[model samples]
Target: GDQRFGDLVFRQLAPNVWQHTSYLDMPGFGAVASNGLIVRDGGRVLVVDTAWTDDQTAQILNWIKQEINLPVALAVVTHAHQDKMGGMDALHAAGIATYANALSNQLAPQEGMVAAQHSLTFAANGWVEPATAPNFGPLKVFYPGPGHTSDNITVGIDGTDIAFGGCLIKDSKAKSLGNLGDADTEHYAASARAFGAAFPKASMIVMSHSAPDSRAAITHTARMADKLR
Candidate 1:
């Protein structure tokens, strides 16, 4: 199932999983679309990453309530970038709890960006810190290591075998690692390899700015990281 509202498009990837794409203009990158995921489990919905702004995030929440007929129970910020956390204020205003890695919280403000409300400290959440698969029903949040950004994370929808790679994994056609301004380029390849090994069964890999595909996306990113290094 698929629906479009203004610049946001929701495409159902599985029975209760939908991928939302929001078109936005990125600095230096020109016009690009950021991707996020929505997982509907019974009466609850979990949103991964907010498109670009408060209004954009509000649109997604409205679409969910009106169309999907489910209340968004939780949201996860994959990173601290504008494309990922730009709508933290919107989610907070909506009374939706948002979570992000502790590193993101620290780095975001340093970059003059806003951070999410809830923090997932690696030391506190030992198992899920580096690479543990902490299952949340049919969903799991995975943090391999420093790749696109030091705070980047990925979401895996078990039901669909889809991994929301955020900006850690690049599009199939992406020849070079996209944005390196905030990226830890030195450890990028290792991070990509870790993610691939962690989610070998992820048949579909969805990136923040590209079409969803398979492990080939990870491979492509890894190769690019290698050449650049």
Candidate 2:
């Protein structure tokens, strides 16, 4: 039988872009399902976010290595949360370059610890940051505003018209406006509005946790944010 939430799923949104969904099923923390994406840029691989514990991180990496020989060239963390960026140490250990905005880098070390201790239920399979995690990517780290988190950063994958919304984007059909408590409700809405306006024509949009929808996913979230505001 498939794991209740189904097997680790993957989809290609663009020519060489792929997304993977994690089956987070560990009792109290089981409900939180996070997603990570892999993008191939001219033979180089750029991973959007790293999953929770090392075991889960290894599962994602195994899938990637089996499919492509090109090592992970870069990684962009959407925010400072551990659930999304906790696997940084794993990627770094595999010799991959990572990038996060100044705010994410500054706050990752702090908030990350708290989430690690509380939100995560798989304590035995804990995580560790890479010894030499790189700074923000060469591309622009657009901190549109204090969205999901004051440190949240939206990264634009070069050559591909796709943006990883991180936790800033919400599942419109969701029953409630789930706030991570790290973001400003007001700024989150304002920044998302700006993002939709700026990348109005993107072929696809990816979120760190929610199910992947079309570019319309952007609109779904923007509308939800507006309602919250």
Candidate 3:
């Protein structure tokens, strides 16, 4: 199923997955786009990231509720950046459960941002500084160290080989790292490398702010990290 509402577009990419794209203007970036994922299973929907704003996120939630005819079982913010967690309040208002890495929750308020209502903390003694791999239903959330941010994570759909690299991976045509305000430049490459190793079977990779299709999204970002050094 594919639908568009103003600047929001939701296109089905697989049997039970849809890609949601929203366009907005950043203060200094002019026009920018952000992407999220909707995974449907049984009668429930899992929202990966919420666009870039509360209004945009509300639209997405309503669309899923009325159009897709599925209740949002859960929403996961890939990071603490505005593009990822900007709609968290709307999600919370709707009484929908939302989650994010504990690190992200810790840093969001410090960054003058809103964090997800629920926290997905690493298991005791299972905490890895850069990335911690955790599974939610059929999706695997892999935190490969710090790249775009200390809490950046990638979501991989099990059995589909589709991975959402969030902001940690760049688009194929990207010429630079894009934004580095919260980036861990010293460990970005290592993080990307760790992600690649963690999901070697991922054949389709979707990025947070770019068109999805590039299978080399992870490697491309890693290369950009090297050039930045």
Candidate 4:
């Protein structure tokens, strides 16, 4: 829990899972933080997302090697945003494998993110289990319709109630829906509802920019969506 570098921090969420957070200082938003997951399985770890920069991402790998003492078996990016895959360069340089869905990979280069190494073409409401992961997995990846972004995906750690909601699920302290620039507002409510249904047991939702919260956050997001409707 005490791990820290710049504005990045780590907090253990479960026996085999940890949450990593890093911040990006946007002009209007100031310091916007993002979260990722680290799940230790066997002798290696599976990571979700990356830091805002390659330097920060490299520090993440170093911390894991020195602190957790395991190589990152594979990396998964939940979406195409910079906050999700900005560190793809660092991960690729370390010879780590990267996994992502088709749309995310297609948009990665446009966003200036390093394209993930492995990709699976998914439908609009696509849902895939760990079996589909290339060389690494046990996390359920689901694109429960679009809300935050067209390609935003949520990842749930296998055998646990913990799920990383990325920017799709709001944080504990969230008072607003955050960014809606690329959001599918009309379908936001359905997306939130589908996310909850996708992982009905997702009790602990690791969030970006705020503390890990509960399933109620999804409910709250849906409520907000309804009000917007």
Candidate 5:
């Protein structure tokens, strides 16, 4: 696949797990937004995060359907960011369950409406609404603390060595070690450390953006934090 923006690229990480990165054209925002997945046993697919808006969500679902017919068992929003949680309704309509940290709801009042309308605008564009949480899965949701926002959740897929750490932390190649113009540095680092402690033997850490790699990714983020400060 080309590396240009707006191009959708898929990377097969494990047997039933795949990562889809949608390069969106959010003029004011960054050039890209990413989402990940974990197709569990019994063909139940777990979507890590959603895209920027409903239009992008539709395109993602279409691509998934074309490749597989498994139901989206759950849509785990990594945090309160629009690019990650904006399309929750779209996933809900598609019979997919949703999960997130408690703080997600706390921060939603400020950012949720924006994300909701982002989904509403593409309401007629084949958007799939997601089902409520505790929908259907054996995974565990961990709210390390107020990291990226007051709501950043790390999802640990039951029986799998994968953990979706979300945007609480970025890869080493990240340009800066600061927050997304709205994160608490103290809490962010503490939350990241907590995430590492939760899954001490994590085989792979799936991030919302950037590439999903091994636990070394966390170490790299720690180093970056030290350098930035």
Candidate 6:
């Protein structure tokens, strides 16, 4: 079932997987849509990222309680960007556990986003899986180097074969390499390639700022990244 709350919309994309989208208006950068994920398991759920603001994040919590009827056990933020962890305050307020890449935690304060409560080190081009929640595992966290941000990472859900690419991968609607402030352009292609190899069965890659697309989105972002020179 699809539902809306405040500036966010939740769409069920796969079995027990929901895509929550929100909009933000960046004066000079223009308005762009961002997406997070709501994943349900036995008796609980996990949020992949927070909404763009605390208010919207709280709405996410409400949606889960009112609609999904499942408790959100935790959230795994893929980056320190607002689009990923902007609702840090709300999550903390709700006493929800949080996790992120070790580097993303350190970079959060400087980026004006709150830090995650827990973190794990990631190899430059390797993957790691934390014992996320009581019912969440096989949530592979892969760092393919860097594309959108230096600390960006992708989360792959095992059974569903769905990957949450955060801001590292782009959908087909992307026209340019976006937000390269902390990007490693030279390694973007390789990073994306590694992402592809890391989860070959992740046919549906749910990205941060675009609609969910196939694994080809990783390749498409690589080509887009390469054109940056």
Models sorted by lDDT, best on top:
6, 4, 1, 3, 5, 2
User: Which tens-of-lDDT digit does each residue in 1-229 have in candidate 6?
Assistant: 6677767889999878899998889999887788998888778888899999999899989989987797788888888889888999999999998988888999999999999998867644476644433345546778877777888888888889798888888886678777888888888888877888888888898888887887778888888877766
C-alpha positional error of residue 132 in candidate 6 after TM-score superposition, expressed in Å = 8.2
Candidate 1 displacement at residue 26 in angstroms: 3.5
Worst 10 residues of 1 by lDDT: 126-135
Give candidate 3's error at residue 117 in angstroms.
2.2
Score residue 116 of candidate 4 by CA lDDT: 92
lDDT of 1 by residue, 1-229 (tens): 5588877998888888888888777669788888999898888898999988889999999888887887788888889888898888899899987788878888888766678766775543322553322225676777888889888887777767888889999876796777888889889998887888777789899888887887888888898888757
Give the lDDT of residue 82 in candidate 2: 68
Alpha carbon lDDT of each predicted model: 0.81, 0.62, 0.81, 0.83, 0.63, 0.83
Q: How accurate is candidate 1 locally (lDDT)?
A: 0.81
The TM-score of candidate 1 is 0.91
Clash counts for all predictions: 0, 0, 3, 0, 10, 0
Per-residue lDDT over 132-201 for candidate 5, one digit per residue giving the tens place of the 0 to 100 score? 3444364556666655666566767666677777777677577665445766666666667777777776
TM match of model 3 to true structure: 0.90
Q: Write the per-residue lDDT of candidate 3 for residues 1-229, one digit (tens) a residue.
A: 5588767998888888889988778779687888999998777888899888889999998788776797787888888888888888889888888788988888888766688777776533323332332235677776788888888877788878788888888876788887889899999998887877877888888887777865677778888798666
Query: TM-scores across all candidates?
Result: 0.91, 0.77, 0.90, 0.93, 0.78, 0.93
Candidate 2: misplaced stretches above 4 Å? 1-7, 25-29, 113-141, 158-161
Worst 10 residues of 5 by lDDT: 119-128
Better of 3 and 6 by lDDT: 6
Write the residue-wise lDDT of candidate 2 on 10-83 in tens digits: 66666787776665555775557677677776667777777765566666778788776677777766667766
Give the per-residue Cα lDDT of candidate 3 at 31: 77
Q: Give the Å shift of residue 113 in candidate 3.
A: 2.5
